[PDB]
Copies of this chain bind each other. A is one copy, B any other.
Amino acid sequence: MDYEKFLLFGDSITEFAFNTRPIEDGKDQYALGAALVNEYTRKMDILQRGFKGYTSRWALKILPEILKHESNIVMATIFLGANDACSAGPQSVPLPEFIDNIRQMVSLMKSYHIRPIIIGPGLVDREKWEKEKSEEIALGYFRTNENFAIYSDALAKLANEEKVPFVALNKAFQQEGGDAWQQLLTDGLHFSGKGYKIFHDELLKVIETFYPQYHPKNMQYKLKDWRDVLDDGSNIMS
């Protein structure tokens, strides 16, 4: 009964990934983490390591601690940049350091034989975000789609160089055209259920392409189907 682990590593978008009630409307929404645990049930444990407001610099400090303690991680997402790409302020991390920080994470994961997946920033509803975060905007701490695209492009390049999959959420979020993308966000930065569903489906696509043995449809469903269990339970594990 040792399960392989799938690590989700990142910021608030990873920390918030299991909440079906992101708004106080009572109503339930799709949650990436919930879907992952469900589809990987009796297949792989989902290990959530998301830290709201964190950057690639701070995340780099914590990653070795995670990898030292946890056993049998076989695959992991890295999703940072929604904070790093802020134009100024304490969460800003310049592009060369950002890329090097992510590269170090990929290298460290590879050193544990962990299969990395890089996730790029999604879109920002700037009109909405800047209303709610007016105090930050007054200080000049902008989150723009232009800068998020710069960071996404650099992550695509890094992913290619390190030969790992990249999930381009900024493009995926644009899939229906028009103004449809605005529904993929709750507060203009964090993801709604609809946003998490696109994230999930694109994530699973790169898993099938790069790491098919760890796609839910190819993994062994652990232990006997109940209909096949002997009365005494002697065959459950073999």
Chain A residues with a Cβ under 8 A of chain B: 1-3, 15-16, 18-21, 28-31, 33-35, 37-38, 41-42, 45, 47-54, 57-58, 60-62, 65-66, 68-70, 83, 90-91, 193, 223, 225-227, 229, 231-233, 236-237
Contact = CB atoms under 8 A, between A and B. Distances in A.
Given A30-B20, A90-B231, A236 B15 contact: no
B15 A42 contact: yes
Contacts of A237: 61-62, 65
Copies of this chain, count: 2
A38 to B, nearest CB: 4
Contact of A34 (B15, B31, B91, B227): B31
B15 A233 contact: no
Nearest to A225: B53
B28 A37 contact: no
B37 A48 contact: yes
A91 to B, nearest CB: 7
Contacts of A51: 42, 223, 226
A69 B1 contact: yes
A225 B57 CA distance: 15
B54 A226 contact: yes
B41 A20 contact: no
Contacts of A57: 232-233
